[PDB]
Design a protein around this ligand. Structure first.
Ligand SMILES: [Mg+2]
Ligand SMILES: [Mg+2]
Lengths: 216, 212
């Protein structure tokens, strides 16, 4: 029994959706209402009370990158996610940690705010894009020749690029062609295609939120 | 060849010192001047430009919990740090992540700030202590019956407890006897005793810093 408590537009939740599909395991997806958290969510993640929460045989695993590693360790011989070499594994973890640190808090403001908070977030996210663009270099994947941990860690953001361009006046698609080509590569995988929502859907939802909540 | 670029009072650097000693590997420790970062530190950690940096055969590994895992994966059969069970390993990673997230900012503020910022830091750190005390429960170690990753992740903070008490007017020693007993347990390991600086030394350094 595997249950995933998640929110459709969460790029962090998408990571775990992708990991599960890479391993071809059957699981139950449960959509959470962020304004009305389920008792199960509160019971399983009492410390943070956030999605995604992975429940395996009644036991919770919290934090998306920890979930992905857990899934890779349980089914290591089916579409291995992490590298086998300890140094390369450390580098994968580093870049996944980088993405989390630079985006989870300082980038929610990209769509949920206007004014100075949004402006600060724009500067931060453009720096993230430049840094990852440089890290990718001319490789097919962040994992080198094969799809890996860091690819999973960032690909969900692709479904938000059009939103960031429209609500935060960012230029992403035309400015980072290497990243766009990388995303198109990843999108061909069934796990990724299944996990990522349509970009127009994300945009409509965020626009509606901004109109209703921010009056913008 | 193993080089560790570190700062003596960094509780994050202490983690990697402890892991290295747990594996009994020989390494070169290099003390960094935080106000004058070496060219080697900037070359090896261009993204964050912070200590600790572990250099192994000329290749950098950054971030202390990633360093500890790296060390454990290179020498897994000598004093294993992480659990062998994947679920237990996920929980260890969770609590190490919790510690990093909740402390990295509000513990700098404990000693480097005053006023509302320091008061806010005090509330956050007391919450951390209560949460970890609850998680430890009646176990000998965060790792259960044996010293493990989460123990390594938090034990360096012990060397700062006196500082937090004195500069932030916190009560820790009298309020968390289970955590105090846990720290005494950890201190019996040579790796931990070697890594943790004297509590009074940390306080003097911080006091001088606050004045100047
Ligand atoms: Mg690979
Ligand atoms: Mg153990």
């Amino acid at each position: 029994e595997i249950i995933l408590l998640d929110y459709w537009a969460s790029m962090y939740g998408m990571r775990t959706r992708i990991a599960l599909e890479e391993k071809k395991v059957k699981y139950e997806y449960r959509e959470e209402d962020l304004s009305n958290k389920s008792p199960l969510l509160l019971q399983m993640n009492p410390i943070h009370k956030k999605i995604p929460v992975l429940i395996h045989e009644g036991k919770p695993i919290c934090e998306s990158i920890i979930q992905v590693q857990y899934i890779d360790e349980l089914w290591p011989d089916t579409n291995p996610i992490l590298p086998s070499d300890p140094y390369q594994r450390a580098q994968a973890r580093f870049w996944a940690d980088y993405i989390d640190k630079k985006t989870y808090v300082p980038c929610k403001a990209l769509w949920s705010e206007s004014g100075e908070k949004q402006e600060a977030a724009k500067i931060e996210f453009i720096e993230v894009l430049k840094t990852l663009d440089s890290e990718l270099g001319d490789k097919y994947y962040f994992g080198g020749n094969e799809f890996g941990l860091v690819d999973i860690a960032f690909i969900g953001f692709y479904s938000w690029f059009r939103t960031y361009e429209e609500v935060a006046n960012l230029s992403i698609v035309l400015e980072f062609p290497k990243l766009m080509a990388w995303a198109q590569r990843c999108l061909k995988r069934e796990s990724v295609a299944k996990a990522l929502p349509d970009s127009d859907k994300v945009l409509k939802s965020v626009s509606d939120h901004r109109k209703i909540i921010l009056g913008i």
